[PDB]
Amino acid sequence: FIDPTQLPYNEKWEFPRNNLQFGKTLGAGAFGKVVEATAFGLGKEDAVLKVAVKMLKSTAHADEKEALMSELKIMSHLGQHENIVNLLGACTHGGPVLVITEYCCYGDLLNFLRRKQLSSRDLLHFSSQVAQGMAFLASKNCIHRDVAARNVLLTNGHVAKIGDFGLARDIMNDSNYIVKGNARLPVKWMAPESIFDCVYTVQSDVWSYGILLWEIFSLGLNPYPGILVNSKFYKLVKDGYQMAQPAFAPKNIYSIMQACWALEPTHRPTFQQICSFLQEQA
C-alpha cells in the first residue's frame, strides 16, 4: 500500500561480527551458504543464542553481493512474526555481509515428514502456522515465490516457520528446479499464470501453498507422483488437472487445496481466509 520495494537498509540491525562464533554449515548454494553460529550478546537480553548466518561464498561478486543485500533489506522491513524465520541482526561493515537469523533446530518440514509419531492435529497445526506466516508476508506486500515444504522450518515446540534459503539453496543440482530458459524454477509448485507469464502475486503464492498442503497431508511425497515435468505436464496443469486427495487429508483440507488450485487467480482464497477456516476447523 504505502511502501514500494526501494528502501535502503536500517542500521539498527547492525551487530559486531566479532561476537559471532561460526559452527557447522547447514546448507549451501552456488554463491551462498548458511552456517550455524553462536551470537555473543545479541539483542537487549544479552543472550548467547545459537543462530544461523547467511553469507556469500568464496566465489561471487557483483549482483550476488546485491542479492544478499536485497534479501537483508527485504527481511529488515517484514518485522518479527512467530511463523516466519525472523531476522535477528546483520554485519554489513568491516567485512562481508552477514545476515543473522533465528536458528530452527528441527530442520525443514519436508525431511521431518519423510523421517516420520505424527498426528492429525500435528498436520493441521503445521498447515495453520504456515498460513499465518504467509498472511503476514501478504500483509507486508511481500511475494514469497518459493512456497514449499522444503522452505518451512520447525523450531522449538515443532512450531513451523516459513522462510527461504535463497542464495543458500543448491538449486543447480536439485531436480525439483526445472531448466526453463535462463532460469531454474520449482515448476511443480507454481501457479500456471506464473510458469507461463512469469506473473508472481500473492494469489500465486496461494497456489503454491495448496501444493504445500498436499505435501503435508501426504507426509512428504513429491507432488504429481510419477509425472515428469514436460510439455504434457504443462498442458495438464493448464487444462485443470489436480492431484488426488492425500490419504491423510480430511475432505475439508482437500477442499482448501482445490480452492488454492483455481485456474483463475482471483478465485483462489486469501491467506487470511485460509487461517480463519483452519482456525474454525479446530
Ligand SMILES: COc1ccc(COc2ccc(Cn3cnc4cc(C(=O)N5CC6(COC6)C5)cnc43)cc2OC)cn1
Ligand atoms: C518470505 O520471505 C522470507 C522470510 C524469511 C526468510 C529467512 O529464511 C531463512 C533464513 C535462514 C535460514 C537458515 N536456517 C535457520 N535455521 C535452520 C535450520 C536448518 C536445518 O536444516 N537444521 C537445524 C539442524 C539441527 O542440525 C542443524 C538441521 C537449516 N537452515 C536453517 C533459513 C531460512 O529459510 C528456511 C527469507 N525470506
